[PDB]
Design a protein around this ligand. Structure first.
Ligand SMILES: Cc1cc2nc3c(=O)[nH]c(=O)nc-3n(C[C@H](O)[C@H](O)[C@H](O)COP(=O)(O)OP(=O)(O)OC[C@H]3O[C@@H](n4cnc5c(N)ncnc54)[C@H](O)[C@@H]3O)c2cc1C
Length: 286
């Protein structure tokens, strides 16, 4: 039994993914020795960077032996020329095969793309030779978007990518308990959504940082979950890692959940996050 439990944990941790901002290239260089070659590393898209900064980060990811995944924030783009400015820049520096497309955090779109589907269905990703497009998933819903609109958006984006012959994957918002993603993942399989799913996990970080992100992201923080994950603001430790969620995922994930990997959000710093992964695997004997 210990042997089979270790094997299931080793499979779940195979091909885990990471992310950086354009400000984190030095951290990536320091972390690289213990990051598996080929690891998918996102470059998130948020205000406060130039396209050149994002392209340089993606280039370094590739040079270090990893697979860059530029994020595209639809609502931050003014028009097709704006998007092509970034895509042309990326195509010139990386093997542009993976992107991740989201509506973006603006409350009001800045341009011609209302949401991720508007960008995806425009055809532009196919023009640039993209073979993999990731999309969001929200097992606990979203503060601004109804469950029904989230599900329809997922179905419409999957349908658009299928029509264009572009493979897709899903990356979920993190949670502080495994129950929402376990239920939600089986449900999307039932609706015929069979693409690979990367279950998002919050990396080890200060409890205050985790709770601030969770409030902004609409992540559940019921009393029972806060106690189980260890998120008390009077905690003697002051930080929390994702082991409570991993401990439910590894035994309960099954064939009914389909193709599943893990994604780590480095809320506490990329080096700290990957060191946690290395040390967790070591303590579990994998
Ligand atoms: C894994 C992951 C990575 C992310 N990375 C980034 C990132 O790099 N940069 C970033 O800015 N954000 C990022 N986000 C956040 C995401 O942009 C926001 O959650 C956004 O509010 C919704 O984007 P979406 O792609 O899920 O929405 P979509 O699937 O595009 O939209 C879902 C539905 O809601 C509508 N809609 C979209 N936005 C709103 C709104 N604000 N109010 C009401 N209806 C709306 C759409 O028209 C559509 O009908 C990420 C989220 C996830 C889960």
């Amino acid at each position: 039994t210990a042997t089979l439990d270790k094997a299931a944990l080793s499979r779940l941790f195979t091909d885990y993914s990471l992310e950086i901002t354009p400000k984190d290239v030095e951290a990536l260089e320091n972390a690289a020795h213990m990051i598996p070659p080929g690891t998918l590393i996102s470059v998130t898209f948020l205000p406060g960077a130039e396209y050149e900064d994002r392209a340089r980060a993606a280039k370094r990811i590739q040079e270090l032996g990893f697979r860059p995944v530029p994020h595209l924030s639809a609502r931050r783009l003014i028009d097709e020329a704006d998007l092509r400015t970034y895509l042309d820049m990326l195509k010139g520096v990386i093997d542009l095969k993976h992107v991740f497309v989201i509506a973006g955090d603006p409350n009001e779109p800045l341009g011609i793309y209302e949401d991720a589907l508007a960008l995806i269905d425009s055809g532009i990703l196919k023009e640039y030779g993209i073979e993999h497009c990731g999309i969001s998933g929200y097992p606990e819903g979203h503060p601004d978007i109804t469950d029904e609109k989230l599900a329809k958006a997922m179905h419409d984006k999957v349908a658009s990518l299928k029509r264009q012959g572009i493979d897709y994957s899903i990356m979920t918002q993190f949670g502080f308990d495994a129950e929402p993603v376990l239920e939600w993942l089986k449900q999307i399989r039932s609706e015929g959504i069979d693409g690979p799913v990367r279950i998002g996990l919050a990396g080890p970080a200060s409890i205050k940082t985790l709770l601030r992100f969770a409030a902004r992201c609409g992540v559940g923080t019921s009393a029972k979950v806060v106690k189980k994950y260890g998120l008390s603001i009077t905690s003697l430790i002051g930080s929390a890692g994702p082991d409570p969620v991993i401990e439910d995922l590894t035994p309960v994930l099954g064939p009914e959940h389909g193709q599943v990997h893990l994604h780590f959000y480095p809320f506490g710093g990329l080096v700290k996050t990957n060191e946690w992964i290395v040390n967790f695997k070591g303590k579990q004997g994998i």
